[PDB]
Structures are given as structure tokens and as C-alpha cells.
From a paper:
Protein tyrosine phosphatase 1B (PTP1B) is a negative regulator of leptin signaling in the hypothalamus, where it dephosphorylates the active site of leptin receptor–associated Janus kinase 2 and decreases signal transducer and activator of transcription 3 (STAT3) phosphorylation and transcription of the anorectic neuropeptide, pro-opiomelanocortin (POMC). As such, there has been substantial interest in the development of PTP1B inhibitors for the treatment of obesity. Focusing on the variants in and near the ordered catalytic domain, we ascribed structural mechanisms to their functional effects using in vitro enzyme activity assays, room-temperature X-ray crystallography, and local hydrogen–deuterium exchange mass spectrometry. By combining these complementary structural biology experiments for multiple variants, we characterize an inherent allosteric network in PTP1B that differs from previously reported allosteric inhibitor–driven mechanisms mediated by catalytic loop motions.
Some of these variants are located near known allosteric sites: for example, D245G and Q78R are adjacent to the conformationally bistable loop 16, which is known to be allosterically linked to the bistable, dynamic, catalytically essential WPD loop in the active site. The locations of others, such as I19V in the α2′ helix and P302Q in the Pro-rich region immediately C-terminal to the allosteric α7 helix, do not correlate with previously known allosteric mechanisms for PTP1B, indicating that further biophysical investigations would be needed. Compared with WT, D245G and Q78R significantly decreased catalysis in vitro, consistent with them having the most extensive LOF effects in cells. Somewhat surprisingly, I19V also decreased catalysis in vitro, despite having no statistically significant effects in cells. These mutations decrease kcat but do not change Km, consistent with allosteric effects from their locations distal from the active site. The mutations were evident in 2Fo–Fc and Fo–Fc electron density maps for D245G and I19V. For I19V, IADDAT difference features span the mutation site, central β sheet, and active-site P loop. For example, I19V decreases exchange in the N-terminal α1′ helical region and many other peptides throughout the protein but has little effect on exchange at the active site, consistent with its weaker catalytic effect in vitro and insignificant functional effects in cells. Indeed, the pockets near I19V, Q78R, and D245G are bindable by dozens of small-molecule fragments as well as small-molecule buffer components that became fortuitously ordered in crystals.
Residue numbers in the entry: 2 to 285
The structure:
Amino acid sequence: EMEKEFEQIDKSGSWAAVYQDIRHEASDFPCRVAKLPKNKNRNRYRDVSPFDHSRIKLHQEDNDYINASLIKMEEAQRSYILTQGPLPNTCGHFWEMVWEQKSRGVVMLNRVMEKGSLKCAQYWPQKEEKEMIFEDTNLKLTLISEDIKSYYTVRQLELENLTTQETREILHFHYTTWPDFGVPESPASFLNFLFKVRESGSLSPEHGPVVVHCSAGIGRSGTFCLADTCLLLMDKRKDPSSVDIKKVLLEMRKFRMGLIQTADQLRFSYLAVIEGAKFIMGDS
Ligand SMILES: [Mg+2]
């Protein structure tokens, strides 16, 4: 059982030790496309790269590279794209990926400025009347509406493929209160955020995989996917205490390196899942 395991690690203060076992056992696959010199400026961080086997490919012919990985959770029937926060020069690639992969939601878990540095380009419009045009990928993006809440903001966006003149509606879920340092004191607002994403239909299989990102696409982004998949497996399985968070994390790390960047984040993910188990083991 998982609450038990949490108690044992916390009383022992051995989160750092558990976290290292995961690092040592984590997969390593080649990242050759990402390290090509032609792609050095498509990567925000030199030590965070997509494996070649799970990388998302753009349908461009000159350069198909974007720092983005497809995570396929086959038992849970969930797929996610994890990516870095766009760079000033990759905003057009980012929306091209969203278009090509038929995604319906974008989950953003960082602020554009954190700790006094820029963690992400401003890649969506801020006013209805000032749309954005990505000339390189021939896409137009318009803010349709914006619902600001205390812990998160939901935006409706219209993405128009200027070449074909087709349009789709994208939902942008922006969690705005992740603290600059550490992790949230309680998982309550995180879980409420996660269930709003679920309720929107963005995680469902009639759509392309949801795009999740922070700054590197591995820390907070990993916490989000890990919690969603764990909670889904608890629904599906005959034995809900047969779900091992550590096993699930290692399976996801076959698809992108480094998911969950700190022992604090690991602790927090346990907390989110354990608390979330209450509201899906039958609390209407
Ligand atoms: Mg206005």
C-alpha cells in the first residue's frame, strides 16, 4: 500500500535516498537528433533532451526537430506530449506541433517570469484584438476569452491554419501559483486544476495528446502526468493499492529523461495521488 510507504519514508526523512534509487534505475536512450549543432538553438537547456525514439517530429522537411517527447501510458490509455517552454524562435514550431498532433489542450505549469529570469516566451495573445501570426509555420492564433481564477487561468484560443483556412479551438490551462521555490504546501489546488483539465475533454482519446509544459518539461510537467496516470490506474484496476508510484515513474522515464526533478517533487506527487484517491474511491 502507498499511504504506508509514504509514512515510512517521511518519518525516516529518506526522500533523498528513494529519489536516488529512481535516478540510478532510470533508462538512458540516445538523444542524437537533439545534439546536432543545427538544433542547438531549439533547446532551452543543454542537459534536457528528448530521446530519439519518443521525440515528436514536425512535418517540416528542412528541420523536423522540437524538444518534445510523446509519453504513451498503455495500461492507462493516456498519452501526453511533454515539451519545454517555447523559446522566442520556437513559438511557431510549438503551435505547429499542436496543430499536427491534433491536441485540444495546452497545460502550462510555470509563469513567464520566475526568479527574475524568463522561463518561457509569451506564446499566446494577451488581448482579443491583438492576434498573433507565426509567419514561419503559417499559423494565426487569437485569444477568444480568458477566465482568471485564484490558482489558475483558462483561456480559449482559436488556431487557424492559414494555408488550409481551417480553424480549431484550443484550451490553455495555466497553473499560476506554483511557488518559485519548492512545491505547493498542499495538493488541493493542484488536484482541482488537474480535474478541470480532465473535465474539459482535453485528456480524452478522441483528441490528440495534451501538450504539457513548464520551463524544462520534466519537473512540474512530470508531477502532472504522474499524478493523472496513477489516479487513472486506481480507477481501472481491481486492486487500487497495486499501483506503485515508483514503477509508474520509471515507465514514464523511458519516454523522457528526468521526470520529477527533486525529492520534494517526488514527495509532493505521493501526496497528490494519496489525497486524490479519496475523491475517486467514491466521494461524489
Ligand atoms: Mg481589453
